[PDB]
Amino acid sequence: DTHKSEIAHRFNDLGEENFQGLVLIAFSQYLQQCPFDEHVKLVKELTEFAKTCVADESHAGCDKSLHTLFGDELCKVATLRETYGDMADCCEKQEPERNECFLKHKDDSPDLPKLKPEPDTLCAEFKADEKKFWGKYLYEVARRHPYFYAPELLYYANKYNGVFQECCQAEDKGACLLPKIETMREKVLASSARQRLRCASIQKFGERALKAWSVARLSQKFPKADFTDVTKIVTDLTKVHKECCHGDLLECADDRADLAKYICDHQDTLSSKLKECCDKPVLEKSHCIAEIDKDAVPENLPPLTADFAEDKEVCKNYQEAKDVFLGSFLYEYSRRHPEYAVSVLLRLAKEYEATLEDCCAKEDPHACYATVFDKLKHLVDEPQNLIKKNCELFEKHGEYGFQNALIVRYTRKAPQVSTPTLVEISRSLGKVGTKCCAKPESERMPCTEDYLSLILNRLCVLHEKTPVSEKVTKCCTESLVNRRPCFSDLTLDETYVPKPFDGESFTFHADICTLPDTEKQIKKQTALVELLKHKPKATDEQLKTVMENFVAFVDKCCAADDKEGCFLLEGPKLVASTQAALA
Ligand SMILES: O=C(O)c1cc(I)cc(I)c1O
Ligand SMILES: O=C(O)c1cc(I)cc(I)c1O
Ligand SMILES: O=C(O)c1cc(I)cc(I)c1O
Ligand SMILES: O=C(O)c1cc(I)cc(I)c1O
Ligand SMILES: O=C(O)c1cc(I)cc(I)c1O
Ligand SMILES: O=C(O)c1cc(I)cc(I)c1O
Numbered sequence: 094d095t096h097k098s099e100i101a102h103r104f105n106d107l108g109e110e111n112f113q114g115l116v117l118i119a120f121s122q123y124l125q126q127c128p129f130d131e132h133v134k135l136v137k138e139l140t141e142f143a144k145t146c147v148a149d150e151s152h153a154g155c156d157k158s159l160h161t162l163f164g165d166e167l168c169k170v171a172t173l174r175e176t177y178g179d180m181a182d183c184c185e186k187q188e189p190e191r192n193e194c195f196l197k198h199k200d201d202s203p204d205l206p207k208l209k210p211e212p213d214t215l216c217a218e219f220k221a222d223e224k225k226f227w228g229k230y231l232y233e234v235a236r237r238h239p240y241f242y243a244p245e246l247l248y249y250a251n252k253y254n255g256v257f258q259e260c261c262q263a264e265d266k267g268a269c270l271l272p273k274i275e276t277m278r279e280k281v282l283a284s285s286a287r288q289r290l291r292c293a294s295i296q297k298f299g300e301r302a303l304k305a306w307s308v309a310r311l312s313q314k315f316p317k318a319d320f321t322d323v324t325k326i327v328t329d330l331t332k333v334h335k336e337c338c339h340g341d342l343l344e345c346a347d348d349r350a351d352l353a354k355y356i357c358d359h360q361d362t363l364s365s366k367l368k369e370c371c372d373k374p375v376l377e378k379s380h381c382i383a384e385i386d387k388d389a390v391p392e393n394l395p396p397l398t399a400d401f402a403e404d405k406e407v408c409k410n411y412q413e414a415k416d417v418f419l420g421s422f423l424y425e426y427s428r429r430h431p432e433y434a435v436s437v438l439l440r441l442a443k444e445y446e447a448t449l450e451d452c453c454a455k456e457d458p459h460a461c462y463a464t465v466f467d468k469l470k471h472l473v474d475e476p477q478n479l480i481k482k483n484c485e486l487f488e489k490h491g492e493y494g495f496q497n498a499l500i501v502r503y504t505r506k507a508p509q510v511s512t513p514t515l516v517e518i519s520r521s522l523g524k525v526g527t528k529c530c531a532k533p534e535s536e537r538m539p540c541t542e543d544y545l546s547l548i549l550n551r552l553c554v555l556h557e558k559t560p561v562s563e564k565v566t567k568c569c570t571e572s573l574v575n576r577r578p579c580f581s582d583l584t585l586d587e588t589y590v591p592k593p594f595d596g597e598s599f600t601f602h603a604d605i606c607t608l609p610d611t612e613k614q615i616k617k618q619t620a621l622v623e624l625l626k627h628k629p630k631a632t633d634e635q636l637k638t639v640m641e642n643f644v645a646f647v648d649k650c651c652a653a654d655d656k657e658g659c660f661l662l663e664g665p666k667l668v669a670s671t672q673a674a675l676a
Contacts, residue, residue: 098155100162103343104143106350111376113140114231114247115342116163121235123167123195123340125203126176129232135166159343160192167195196340199239201289201554208233212270216261219254227254238285240292243337244346245284245383248376252277286547292338293550298573301416304331305442308420309435312427313387315363320424322363326356353379364388387431394429398466401425401445407462408453419446432535433473434542439574440472479581480541487526493614496523500618501636504625506583508591509561512622514552516615521548545577563588591629597668599623601643602660606651617643628675638674642667 096102104112113136120132139162146155154162167184174181183194219226230250235241256277260269294302307327315323329352337345356363357371357378366388370381401407401422410418423442430438445465452461487495500519507515522545529540553569553576560566564586568579605616620643625631631639646667650659 098146098150099159100143100155100157101146101150103159103347104140104147106347107343109140111247111346112143112343114228114250115243115346116140117228117231118235118241118243118246119163119340119342120167121232122199122239122241123163124173124177125200125205125236125239127170127173129229131170132232133228135169139163139166158188159341160188163340164188164191164195192340201239201558203237203239205237210271210274212260212266215270216257216266219257219261223254223257226257227251230254234281238289240289240338241285242288243342244349244376244379245288247346248380249277249281249284251376283547286551288337289554290547290550291334293554294573295335295338297570300331300335302573303334305420305423305439306435307331308423309427309438309442312424313431313435314385316388316428316431317391318363320421322359323424324420326352329355349379350375353382356382390429390431397425397429402459402463402465405459408449408458411449411453432538434476434538436542436546436574436577437472437476437538440578441469443572443574444469444472475578476538476542480537484526484530487523487530492523492527495526496520496618497621497640499523500621501625501633504622505585505629506580507562507565508586508589508626508629510552510556510565511561512619512626514555515622516618518548518552518555520615520618521551542577549576549580562586585629589629591627594627594668594672597664598627600660600664601647601650603650603656605647606656613647617647631675635675639671642670642674 094102107115116136116139117132120127120135124132142154142162145152149155164184177183177198180194180198183191183198186194215226218229227250230253231246234246234249235243256270256273260266260273263269291303294306304327307330308323311323311327311330312318315326318326329348333345333348333352336342336348353375357367360367360371364385366385367382370378370385372378373381404410419442422445423438426441427433427435427438433441448462448465448468449458452458455461486498490498496519499522500515503510503519503522504515510518525541525544525548528544529537532540549568552565556562556565556569564583568576568583571579599620601616601620605613608616617640621636621640624636624639628635646663650656650663653659
């Protein structure tokens with residue numbers, strides 16, 4: 094829904110508080126390096142102009158696009174050419190391409206401090222100015238995660254203030270805040286990863302890909318809903334996601350608020366779980382609906398074969414209404430199977446598609462696809478088998494050893510990838526074992542597939558920035574729903590030529606001794622990646638042996654009276670024993 098004067102329309106619809114937040118988020122994601130108070134000045138300016146348009150729409154500029162108003166306001170700043178050399182040229186053009194320049198200049202790995210929460214500090218800041226405190230959270234998160242879902246960011250910022258309203262009056266503040274903050278952080282990072290993937294899917298694969306994921310996903314949430322209604326909500330949600338992924342943040346939030354009201358209006362025909370969401374204020378209500386659990390499979394549904402294998406008009410429908418037919422298949426399969434990962438359901442519908450494209454060209458099509466459902470079942474078996482093998486490994490070795498196995502796997506599959514990225518990604522992938530291996534059957538397939546999709550998407554995002562591996566290129570571009578199976582099926586990349594051991598290639602030193610154990614591990618895991626890059630054909634055993642000798646070497650030297658001496662002296666011995674082990 095567009096008005097002639099969009100600034101007024103969205104300020105009217107959103108209220109000042111949320112309008113300002115979204116403006117601040119917008120400024121923070123387009124210009125991730127600029128100071129807080131710079132953006133804050135621009136937000137206040139925009140709010141005033143918003144007000145004048147609400148009072149009088151005929152007044153000059155009020156009919157401007159929001160892109161125009163936002164971008165002009167960003168291009169107030171005199172020199173940030175120094176900060177954005179590649180993007181200082183953005184202010185040199187206009188809509189719609191000035192916006193597209195901003196968009197392409199978002200940094201997925203900004204050079205920004207992992208900020209340590211400091212309780213006394215943050216509590217003081219809360220007291221001085223809690224509005225500034227809320228805004229600061231928006232700016233710090235939005236600048237680090239420039240595709241963060243803007244209306245959920247407001248939700249999290251209200252929750253963050255909530256933690257401080259509670260905790261900063263307690264006798265012990267650290268003990269109060271900290272566990273709430275680490276808990277919230279994990280949810281925030283999860284949200285950031287989900288939205289990064291939604292935007293990546295829109296960007297690389299078209300909104301149709303997101304549309305498909307959401308038909309499957311919503312059919313599991315709202316299985317008693319009819320297909321008309323699931324389609325109407327997916328259309329609306331897809332528009333919201335596309336808005337937020339394109340920086341149309343005020344539209345994004347206004348449209349998500351309307352959808353929330355639509356869903357709560359129809360709660361009786363969607364899910365009984367919505368009762369818990371539907372009396373909440375707007376951001377909370379949207380959050381709660383977005384997080385809703387899967388509903389019970391409705392009773393007495395027909396066999397799938399009726400509409401998709403028996404009916405004489407199968408090939409007719411595929412032909413004359415392809416996307417509605419395949420959407421229908423996704424809804425009907427999804428509503429019958431909440432224990433299916435959404436990615437598995439999308440793979441079933443892809444193979445069903447391929448089966449008709451093949452069969453509907455035959456003299457007797459039904460003879461050809463009669464058994465399609467019988468055949469689909471391997472798409473369920475394959476992941477269940479992979480889950481069972483990998484949780485066994487996790488169970489026998491724990492998270493660290495599991496991350497080590499994964500480092501070994503991914504360095505073999507993509508040895509061209511930067512050592513920090515192989516380590517970051519491998520570590521992330523290993524956490525699926527803690528997250529998911531102890532879940533029951535109802536939930537273990539969705540937990541693993543969802544979580545692995547998020548992490549492989551991070552890899553794809555990093556790989557797109559500087560392409561190095563032909564195989565990773567393949568798995569990241571071939572097909573979104575086959576991404577995970579693609580990465581799982583990559584083998585050791587023999588195209589890669591190791592660069593030899595020069596002698597003393599990677600050297601541990603005394604500064605390692607004083608690091609927190611997490612950091613010590615990462616140093617060892619980096620050592621491991623580097624070993625594999627020199628000896629890309631090393632066996633599992635040889636890698637186990639060298640890693641044990643690494644662990645022994647650091648433990649021993651960090652215990653020495655003279656630590657650096659130990660390193661310098663015992664270094665060569667380790668090099669020699671290693672060389673003789675890798676022969
Ligand atoms: O930081 C402030 O002082 C501030 C003030 C206002 I008024 C609105 C937002 I968002 C802010 O961040
Ligand atoms: O994103 C963070 O790193 C983060 C940092 C702090 I301090 C508090 C919360 I909640 C966070 O999510
Ligand atoms: O992802 C959302 O933001 C979302 C928002 C609403 I409102 C409803 C559903 I289902 C969602 O998935
Ligand atoms: O490594 C995999 O290929 C893998 C795939 C699936 I699906 C589940 C788990 I746990 C895994 O470890
Ligand atoms: O502990 C493991 O399960 C493990 C497995 C492999 I494969 C390689 C290394 I180094 C390991 O530490
Ligand atoms: O929640 C989503 O809408 C979502 C969308 C895609 I595309 C992939 C994953 I994992 C998701 O969780």
